[PDB]
Amino acid sequence: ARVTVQDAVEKIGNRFDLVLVAARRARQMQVGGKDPLVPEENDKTTVIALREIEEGLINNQILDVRERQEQQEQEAAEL
Amino acid sequence: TEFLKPRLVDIEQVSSTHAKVTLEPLERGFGHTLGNALRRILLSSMPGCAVTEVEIDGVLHEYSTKEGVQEDILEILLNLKGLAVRVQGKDEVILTLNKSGIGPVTAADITHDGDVEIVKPQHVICHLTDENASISMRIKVQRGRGYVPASTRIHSEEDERPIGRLLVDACYSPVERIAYNVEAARVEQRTDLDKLVIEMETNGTIDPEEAIRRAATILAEQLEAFVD
Amino acid sequence: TEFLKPRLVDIEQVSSTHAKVTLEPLERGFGHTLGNALRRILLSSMPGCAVTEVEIDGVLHEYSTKEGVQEDILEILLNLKGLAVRVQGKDEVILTLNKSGIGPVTAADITHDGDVEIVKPQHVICHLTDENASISMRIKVQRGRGYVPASTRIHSEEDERPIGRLLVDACYSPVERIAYNVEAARVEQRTDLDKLVIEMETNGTIDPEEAIRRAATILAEQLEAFVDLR
Amino acid sequence: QDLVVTEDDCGTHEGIMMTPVIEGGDVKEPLRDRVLGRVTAEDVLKPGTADILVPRNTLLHEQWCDLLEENSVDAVKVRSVVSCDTDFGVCAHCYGRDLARGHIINKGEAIGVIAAQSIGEPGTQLTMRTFHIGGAASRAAAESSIQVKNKGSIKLSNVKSVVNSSGKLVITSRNTELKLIDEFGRTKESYKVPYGAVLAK
Amino acid sequence: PAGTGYAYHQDRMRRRAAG
Amino acid sequence: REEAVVWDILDEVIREHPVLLNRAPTLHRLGIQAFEPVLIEGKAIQLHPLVCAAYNADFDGDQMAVHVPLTLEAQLEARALMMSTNNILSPANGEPIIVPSQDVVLGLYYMTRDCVNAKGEGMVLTGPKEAERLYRSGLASLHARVKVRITEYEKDANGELVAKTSLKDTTVGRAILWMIVPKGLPYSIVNQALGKKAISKMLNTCYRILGLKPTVIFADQIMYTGFAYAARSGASVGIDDMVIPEKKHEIISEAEAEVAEIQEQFQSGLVTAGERYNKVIDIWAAANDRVSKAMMDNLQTETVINRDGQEEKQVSFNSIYMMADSGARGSAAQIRQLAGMRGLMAKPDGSI
Amino acid sequence: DIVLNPLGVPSRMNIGQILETHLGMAAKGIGDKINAMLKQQQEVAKLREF
Amino acid sequence: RQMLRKATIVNAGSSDFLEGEQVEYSRVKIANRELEANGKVGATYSRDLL
Amino acid sequence: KPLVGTGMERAVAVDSGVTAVAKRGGVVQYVDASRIVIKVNEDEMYPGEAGIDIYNLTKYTRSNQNTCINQMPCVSLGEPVERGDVLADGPSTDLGELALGQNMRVAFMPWNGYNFEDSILVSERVVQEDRFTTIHIQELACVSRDTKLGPEEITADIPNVGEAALSKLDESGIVYIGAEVTGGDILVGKVTPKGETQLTPEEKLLRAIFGEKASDVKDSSLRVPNGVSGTVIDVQVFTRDGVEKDKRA
Amino acid sequence: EIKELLKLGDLPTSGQIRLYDGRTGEQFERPVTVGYMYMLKLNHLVDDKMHARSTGSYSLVTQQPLGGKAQFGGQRFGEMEVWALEAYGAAYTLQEMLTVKSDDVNGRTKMYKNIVDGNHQMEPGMPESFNVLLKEIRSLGINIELEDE
Amino acid sequence: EEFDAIKIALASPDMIRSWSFGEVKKPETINYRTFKPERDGLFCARIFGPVKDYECLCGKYKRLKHRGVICEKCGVEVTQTKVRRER
RNA sequence: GAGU
Ligand SMILES: [Mg+2]
Ligand SMILES: [Mg+2]
Ligand SMILES: [Zn+2]
């Protein structure tokens, strides 16, 4: 994850999409303060996102799922 | 004198055989000064026991092949070099091994002397293929230090040398390998300090940490002549 | 364990600068073990005395020229870096040098303090050409170890910053050269046991025997961390 | 500039039939080396046309290439960038492996720029290499006679020689090639015989 | 419109296609 | 004010933050690579040796440019696409661009190459660790021909890796290099005397069997050991290392009488100026080859000076030959100018 | 004082640097011998001869 | 491939190409997809090297 | 000097003119760091004048590359000298021969990659002996111009300056000779006149807290360039014809 | 002549000598050529070459940073350097160097504030040099307009 | 700010007048003494805008307190100085 | 003028 990204690339596949997915997750931890799944072990948001993708916890589709889950529950609360 | 002493920081015991040891902080140049001095004593000077002589009945020389045995006599000798033995009382013991039948001969098959401990009893020595095959040998273990080869023993010791006595390289020292790596340390002000990473790998007879203690002890014992 | 300690046998002081030191008996392989480990400490860690600060009156900076003097101030400073001094009691002494007339100023012209020995009195410092020229300076000698440059000393304390004090290099470390040879010992009937002949070449003073004692001391102090702490 | 991997599969059957390269005498570019990591267009089997050896859209991996040598494949139709049907770019299949990655190219990668850089760089750098260092002049063009090493039957192509007074086969053709057929029959060595050359056999 | 940008650039291209 | 606490903060920020290094000219994408920075006191950038090839960077005063990827996107672009560990193979040809050069090749060549008996010929060692122990103890040369037991790891038809153990007839040096070799590679790859051409194939093999992580660590290890042994070797360049063949002046006087024969045949008005020009150039061109071949036989195999029973022939350990043969530096062409005949020069015309 | 890399010689064909080094050592050898004779203080006659 | 981008139309299609226009081969093939579906006058062309 | 020379060294050093050479042979009457007086021999010495040549030596001066040009005397007091001998050495010359650098003990061998591609491994000993050490002389200037608003002043009185900073400036506003300076320290106290300026409400508030209102001249004092650090060895002042001179000038 | 001079020095004919590693004390495997080479320190001091910049002055019309260490300048990221990022596919790094790092005036300040707020967010716009290009082309009397979405 | 495509076509006399915010009738750049723009000159502030942010030339209207104001006296609109690179 |  830190040194070699190959296994993280092998989870998603497209290097280009790996970058977009890990950037969107890292933005969540950077700004939202969304809690990390893997122990940080004193690492930056970018590295945490890559570990999370390597172990197969974060995914474009999974992010989109939790986006509608939380947005729909807030719509429910407003009405 | 503003004596800057190091402190033993980490002992990563990766295995009972292999251990890494970080050490900091060391003043500039003391990384290699302590690193090498220790490495030398640890390899050549740490004392222990090893097979010095072997006598197998029906064996005139090390290049012959015994029937019903997979390994050639040389291959057998090479296994005895690596045989880990602790002798408690005497400095010289002759162990006897008589074994027969279709079996991988292990170190447990040696008749253990009262004060002689075989540290790895499952250690392979020879493979008997024919069931009718029986092997009988007398393994002489002496206590010494460093690495004393048979080539340096035949040239110096030219007293009694009868035909049949197989001479095998004597590996007294129980340190299997040692390397020290020097990386730079970072302190609040001082930025030219160094860290000493020593990787040891013993067989198991002497503990790695205890071997380090003894090596440093021998070094400090030699400095008793230089007063301070 | 067949423990065998060496003993300091001969100290052949060929000169106050050069000394040979034979050492026996050493068990096989300990000759190079101790030889090199000692050589490294002896070159670096050894403490000594050196000129740290200079103040010549009528000198604002080291790049100026003084009248009636052949040498530029920098040349003079470089000579003081090589000035051999022993201080017995204090670790910091300020020596005064007032000299006049048509003379090569030597180290002996410095007013010697009670506990301050100039090891090379004929050491050249400055050449006075005009007879009417008089030079007056205060040389601060400190005791320390290794090489402490003026660049590493112009970025630490500096609470008082007096215009006139000149900071120059002072290699405190006395040891100029060291080499350790290994020859046959021919003791009783051991043969293998050799001898450690260490040829030292130091500046003034630091005594050969004293230096070896200190070097071995530093080694044994570091070994405390590998014996006491596991 | 514009050329980017746009699609995964153009679904084209098109491709160029590559053949082994034997310039000079030593095999410069082997078929495997020329075809490695290229999509194999059209079910290309073994000599005996009665069983499919290799499939369609299948990236040539090192294992597959090793099998080609055991089977002694003459020539293979391989999917190329030129024969891609993708409009406004090319498909990952027609390109094949990203040589820099060691696997099939990712869609989105800007291939054209990579290509131009790859072609251009050696020239630009070799213009500096044998020139700051370029000193001693060591020319070599004494090609007088061709010597065959492996025994074989002489096979000439596009040649029109005529017997002379001396009794030797004098070639009267410009482009004349000389192959080296083995026992079973396959080209092993190849040379360039010039016009007005004297053939021994 | 390539590499990292291909994701965003195709998302624009569909925004362009649908008005 | 550069306060003490500020350095600790700076140290905190740069961790896991990639920076781009660039060298002019930027000819292919590898001219820019990302690294994790390591803060050093001192004003020069420190570059990794093995990527010197991609940058075409030699430290005769070269300078490089530094760029900070700011955004999270840019950081991840740098770590995933542009990191040096991620970009090994040339995009132009399927070949590893990261390959040991110079000192590294020389060290490994020195270790693997064998010598007649020397210290401790024909010994028997338990592991490569006993071999290392023997060499550093001073009872064996790196070129001693000794039989060692190594256990090589060969990959099976499935994912499972097979381990096999046998007695190999290698030298002490090759045993010690086997320690750097990952489990999975065969022992036979290191068992030959290693040059630059063999080491690249080593890395290629490593990449296709094991994959990226193992290759990266392996490459680093190879660099460390390569330098280390290059320095142990004590390799140097004296003027006695440039060996002139004893038979230069004879070959030259002969070639000089020959050129005189064709000058005489010109003065008779039989041979045209152009024919003589061509035949003088041919005489010298053959003289140059012969002198070069004489130097190379006299230098290549000049260790005709061996032992054990009586006299034997072996490869020369002459420094300049080792340098050229290993592929560390120089070539036979360079050595011709140094020890042999310089040869025929070309005019600015192109004419010789 | 300095450790230079020999791998920067055979390719470069600047063998001047090596001859300079050999002769420089020889020059310094004579220097070290005169230095030794001056430290001993043998005499004018012997220095003159050497 | 980039050299073979363009193509010269010799003979009219169902669009306003007509004789001698040079257009990108991509665009005329996409036109020919819609011609195959709609029939109409097909466009005859020749690929050009540039 | 170079141990391994060619012989051109002497010719280059002497012909370049950077070395002081003797016009006329004789005995040296007076050696000094700053000058050399030689008394000429009777045979060359003209019958008109006293016949004593005085060469004033050029001391630590700036080069075009900011290097240091110094002449050192290479004769002893009261030495017999031949015409056309080197009296004083230029910056890179030793006893009349050309000395461009320094010879030293070199070993050709690989070392742990610290000499990889031409990379050089040097002993601390060389640094300690200060033999490769070099001298660099930089020139900073402070211009007092006449502007539309009024003349600029070279005063030490500058808005917003620590007494630490003003310690090194004299009454006139010029740094003292011999003073060590580092980036941001002020050399010459020079500012440029300023006009009216809408002070942001926060500066209205801040100046109301402190009280120190802005002055006429702004802040354009010459200060040490960032990261350059040195000792002031000399100062020069140019004044025009009729402007009131600084006390320092 | 040189070997003869070496013999007068009691130095070896080879001019190679036995050397010992300072660290280990053991000898190196073979003689090393040792002697005195006359060496020069060139005018290229690292003190004069090292340079670094995050944010500074900007050029007058193009609004991109100035050049050169004497002007506290930004490194030129040139066409060749751009192509490298294009090959890589590194799109945001490239955009960054064209916009928030260079001309984009809104972008640079907004980006700076985001960096101090930890959030490394990209907030790009249009480089000021392109706006200029347009104005220059209309000053030529060629209508160049932006058709929006 | 974000657009889709870019067109180039011939500039009509009429089109050129659309962009223009004033006719320059004088070669004058600035006054030699008050380095301020000359009337209907090449640097005219009355045409291309104010030299300083939200400030007219003669200085009658200052700061955001006077937003889109056109000074009757000098004839300068009080806006951002940014416009001088735009108009 | 510095590395190609
Ligand atoms: Mg180079
Ligand atoms: Mg270079
Ligand atoms: Zn107004």
Render I189-231 in DSSP notation, one character per residue. ----B-------HHHHHHHHHH-----SB-S--EEPPTT--EE
Q: How far is CA B68 from CA B55, B100, F77, in A?
A: 18, 10, 65
User: CB of G17 within 8 Å of any CB in chain J?
Assistant: yes
Query: CA-based diameter of chain A, in Å?
Result: 48
Q: Do D96 and F242 contact (CB within 8 A), yes or no?
A: no
Record the tokens describing residue A27, joined without a space.
């933005």
Integer Cα distance of F99 and F199 in angstroms: 8
F137: left (phi over 0), alpha (psi -120 to 50) or beta: alpha
Whether cis (ω within 30° of 0) applies to the bond prior to J12 is no
Neighbours of chain A (3+ CB pairs under 8 A): D, E, F, J
Strands C147-148 and C124-127: unpaired
Give the domain range for residue J141.
Answer: 64-149
Record the tokens describing residue C119, joined without a space.
């090891």
| DSSP structural state of residue D48 | S
Residues of chain F by 3-state class (helix, strand, coil), percent to 5: 50, 10, 40
Which residues of C, range 168-207, sit inside 8 Å of B by Cβ? none
Strands (E), C131-189: 134-145, 147-148, 166-167, 170-171, 175-184
In chain E, how many H helices and how many E strands?
1, 0
Q: Do I108 and G6 contact (CB within 8 A), yes or no?
A: yes
Q: Min CA distance, F62 vs chain E (Å)?
A: 31
Q: How many angstroms from the chain centroid is the CA of residue F94?
A: 21
* Helical spans, DSSP H, in chain K: 13-19, 45-48
Integer Cα distance of F15 and A43 in angstroms: 8
Q: What sign for the dihedral angle of Cα C139, C140, C142, C145? A: negative
User: Are F103 and G7 within 8 A, CB to CB?
Assistant: yes
Integer Cα distance of C68 and I36 in angstroms: 11
A-D contacts at Cβ under 8 angstroms: 8
Q: Do B70 and B125 contact (CB within 8 A), yes or no?
A: no
3-state secondary structure F163-216: EEEEEECCEHHHHHHHHHCCECECHHHCCCCCCHHHHHHHHHHHHHHCCHHHHH
- State the number of CA atoms in the 13 A half-sphere of G40 facing the CB: 11
On whether F58 is known to bind a ligand per the annotation, the reply is yes
Within 8 A by CB and 6+ apart from B116, the residues are: B85, B86, B87, B88, B93, B95, B141
Question: Which of these, C114, C166, C129, C172, lies nearest to C148 by C-alpha position?
Answer: C172
Integer Cα distance of C20 and C212 in angstroms: 12
F134 chain-B contacts, CB cut-off 8 A: 147
Indicate whether I87 and I140 sit together in one domain: no
Record the tokens describing residue C66, joined without a space.
């003084």
A47 chain-F contacts, CB cut-off 8 A: 16
Which H or E run includes F78?
Answer: helix F72-80
Q: What sign for the dihedral angle of Cα F334, F337, F343, F347? A: positive
Indicate whether I82 and I168 sit together in one domain: no
Integer Cα distance of I130 and A66 in angstroms: 67
Q: How many angstroms is C1' of L2 away from CA of C43?
A: 39
Which H or E run includes B18?
Answer: strand B18-24
| DSSP structural state of residue J96 | H
Give the domain range for residue D191.
Answer: 144-201
* Helical spans, DSSP H, in A1-79: 6-12, 15-27, 45-54, 60-78
Strands B116-118 and B85-87: antiparallel
Question: Which of these, F173, F148, F164, lies nearest to F232 by C-alpha position?
Answer: F173
Give the one of C40, C212, C219 whose C-beta lies nearest to B29's C-beta: C40
Q: Is any atom of strand L within 7 angstroms of residue F311's beta carbon?
A: no
- State the number of CA atoms in the 13 A half-sphere of E14 facing the CB: 5
Question: Which of these, F93, F55, E2, J80, lies nearest to D112 by C-alpha position?
Answer: E2
User: CB of E4 within 8 Å of any CB in chain A?
Assistant: yes
Integer Cα distance of F103 and F96 in angstroms: 19
Q: How many residues does chain B have?
A: 228
Integer Cα distance of J74 and J69 in angstroms: 8
Name beta bridge partners: D187. Answer: D181
Q: Do J149 and K1 contact (CB within 8 A), yes or no?
A: no
Within 8 A by CB and 6+ apart from D91, the residues are: D5, D6, D7, D8, D9, D10, D12, D84
Other CB atoms within a 10 A radius of the CB of residue I143 amount to 12
Strands I102-108 and G2-4: parallel
- State the number of CA atoms in the 13 A half-sphere of A41 facing the CB: 10
User: CB of J148 within 8 Å of any CB in chain K?
Assistant: yes
Question: Sheet containing F65-67: which strands, arranged edge to edge?
Answer: F32-35, F19-22, F65-67
Which nucleotides on chain L have any atom < 7 A from a protein Cβ?
2-4
Integer Cα distance of J141 and J135 in angstroms: 10
Q: Do A63 and A32 contact (CB within 8 A), yes or no?
A: no
Strands (E), chain D: 5-7, 16-18, 76-78, 90-91, 97-98, 103-104, 153-157, 161-163, 169-171, 176-181, 187-193, 198-199
* Helical spans, DSSP H, in C21-86: 30-44, 73-81
How would you class I105 by CB atoms within 10 Å of its CB: exposed for 0-12, middle for 13-18, buried for 19 or more? middle
Integer Cα distance of C175 and C167 in angstroms: 23
Whether cis (ω within 30° of 0) applies to the bond prior to B25 is yes
Report the amino acid identity of residue F88: I
Q: How far is CA C175 from CA C43, C49, C212, I219, in A?
A: 6, 12, 11, 54
F-J contacts at Cβ under 8 angstroms: 109
Neighbours of ion ligand 1 (CB under 5 A): F 58, 60; I 117-118
Give the domain range for residue I195.
Answer: 133-243
In degrees to the nearest 10, what's the CA dihedral of J114, J117, J120, J125?
A: -10
Question: Which of these, C168, C170, C108, C166, lies nearest to C137 by C-alpha position?
Answer: C166
Give the one of D81, D88, D112 whose C-beta lies nearest to H26's C-beta: D88
Q: Do A21 and A9 contact (CB within 8 A), yes or no?
A: no
F63: nearest nucleotide, CA–C1' criterion? L3
Integer Cα distance of F333 and F346 in angstroms: 16
Question: Sheet containing I121-122: which strands, arranged edge to edge?
Answer: I121-122, G2-4, I102-108, J32-39, J16-17
DSSP helix/strand/coil, C94? strand
User: Are H1 and D84 within 8 A, CB to CB?
Assistant: yes
Q: Do C107 and C121 contact (CB within 8 A), yes or no?
A: yes
Name beta bridge partners: I108. Answer: G4
Record the tokens describing residue F174, joined without a space.
């090759």
Give the domain range for residue F330.
Answer: 239-352
Q: What sign for the dihedral angle of Cα K48, K49, K50, K52? A: negative
On whether F60 is known to bind a ligand per the annotation, the reply is yes
Record the tokens describing residue F197, joined without a space.
């051409």
Report the amino acid identity of residue F153: Y
Assign domain B48-172 to its CATH superfamily: DNA-directed RNA polymerase, insert domain (2.170.120.12)
On whether F282 is known to bind a ligand per the annotation, the reply is no
User: Are C171 and I128 within 8 A, CB to CB?
Assistant: yes
Neighbours of chain I (3+ CB pairs under 8 A): C, F, G, J, K
Integer Cα distance of A4 and F80 in angstroms: 8
**J–E contact: 3+ Cβ pairs < 8 A:** yes
Give the one of B5, B11, B228 whose C-beta lies nearest to C225's C-beta: B5
Q: Min CA distance, F51 vs chain E (Å)?
A: 24
DSSP helix/strand/coil, A15? helix
Name beta bridge partners: I31. Answer: I36
Q: How far is CA C180 from CA C21, C35, I120, J27, in A?
A: 9, 6, 28, 13
The three-point CA angle C162-C165-C167 to 5° equals 125
Q: Where in chain C is the domain with CATH 2.170.120.12?
A: 48-172
Q: Do F344 and F329 contact (CB within 8 A), yes or no?
A: no
DSSP helix/strand/coil, D6? strand
Angle between helices J91-98 and F72-80 (to 10 degrees): 130
User: Are F91 and D62 within 8 A, CB to CB?
Assistant: no
Q: Is any atom of strand L within 7 angstroms of residue F59's beta carbon?
A: no
Integer Cα distance of C45 and B5 in angstroms: 13
Q: Is any atom of strand L within 7 angstroms of residue F163's beta carbon?
A: no
Neighbours of chain F (3+ CB pairs under 8 A): A, B, D, E, G, I, J
Question: What's the fold here for domain B1-47+173-228?
Answer: Gyrase A; domain 2 (3.30.1360)
Q: How many angstroms is C1' of L3 away from CA of J122?
A: 35
Integer Cα distance of I75 and F195 in angstroms: 60
Query: CA-based diameter of chain E, in Å?
Result: 25
Residue in chain D lying closest to F87 (CA)? D100
Strands D90-91 and D5-7: parallel
User: Are J126 and K1 within 8 A, CB to CB?
Assistant: yes
Integer Cα distance of J32 and J17 in angstroms: 5
Whether cis (ω within 30° of 0) applies to the bond prior to C25 is yes
Q: Where in chain B is the domain with CATH 3.30.1360.10?
A: 1-47+173-228
Indicate whether I159 and I69 sit together in one domain: no
Q: Do F119 and F139 contact (CB within 8 A), yes or no?
A: yes
Q: Do B119 and B86 contact (CB within 8 A), yes or no?
A: yes
Q: What sign for the dihedral angle of Cα C140, C146, C152, C157? A: negative
- Residue appearing with tokens 């090639």: D177
Within 8 A by CB and 6+ apart from D50, the residues are: none
Q: How many angstroms from the chain centroid is the CA of residue F74?
A: 36
User: CB of B119 within 8 Å of any CB in chain F?
Assistant: no
Q: Do I33 and I57 contact (CB within 8 A), yes or no?
A: yes
* CATH number of the domain enclosing D174: 2.40.50.100
Integer Cα distance of F216 and F183 in angstroms: 14
Strands (E), F53-113: 65-67
Class of domain C1-47+173-230: alpha beta
**Annotated resolution, angstroms:** 3.9
The three-point CA angle I5-I11-I15 to 5° equals 145
Integer Cα distance of D134 and D43 in angstroms: 50
* CATH number of the domain enclosing F266: 1.10.132.30
First to last CA, chain H: 10
E-F contacts at Cβ under 8 angstroms: 4
Integer Cα distance of H50 and H25 in angstroms: 13
Question: Which of these, F51, F47, F9, lies nearest to F29 by C-alpha position?
Answer: F51
Within 8 A by CB and 6+ apart from I191, the residues are: I152, I153, I155, I158, I217, I218, I219, I220, I221
- Residue appearing with tokens 């050595």: F335
Q: Is any atom of strand L within 7 angstroms of residue F61's beta carbon?
A: yes
Determine which of B145, B223, B227 to mutate to test the interface with C (most C C-beta atoms within 10 Å): B223
Strands B104-106 and J16-17: unpaired
Residue in chain E lying closest to J89 (CA)? E3
Cα I199 to averaged position of ligand 3 atoms, centre (Å)? 21
Q: How far is CA B67 from CA B73, B124, B133, D43, I205, in A?
A: 11, 18, 8, 59, 106
Question: Which of these, F53, F88, F319, F107, lies nearest to F223 by C-alpha position?
Answer: F107
Report the amino acid identity of residue I231: T
Integer Cα distance of F90 and D102 in angstroms: 10
Question: Which of these, F246, F252, F275, F253, lies nearest to F263 by C-alpha position?
Answer: F275
Which H or E run includes H8?
Answer: strand H6-9
Indicate whether I152 and I77 sit together in one domain: no
Report the amino acid identity of residue G7: L
Q: Do D46 and D71 contact (CB within 8 A), yes or no?
A: yes
User: CB of J37 within 8 Å of any CB in chain D?
Assistant: no
Q: What sign for the dihedral angle of Cα C209, C212, C218, C220? A: negative
Experimental method: X-ray
Q: Do B33 and B228 contact (CB within 8 A), yes or no?
A: no
Question: Which of these, F85, F18, F32, lies nearest to J87 by C-alpha position?
Answer: F32
Cα-trace Rg, chain B: 22
Backbone angles phi, psi at J80, to 5 degrees: -65, -40
Q: Is any atom of strand L within 7 angstroms of residue F27's beta carbon?
A: no
Integer Cα distance of D1 and F346 in angstroms: 42
L3 closest protein residue (CA to C1'): F62
Record the tokens describing residue B16, joined without a space.
């009972």
Integer Cα distance of I155 and I169 in angstroms: 10
Integer Cα distance of B46 and E18 in angstroms: 81
Report the amino acid identity of residue F246: E
Record the tokens describing residue I235, joined without a space.
């100062």
| DSSP structural state of residue B47 | E
Q: Do D72 and D20 contact (CB within 8 A), yes or no?
A: no
- Residue appearing with tokens 């002019």: F24
Integer Cα distance of J5 and I95 in angstroms: 24
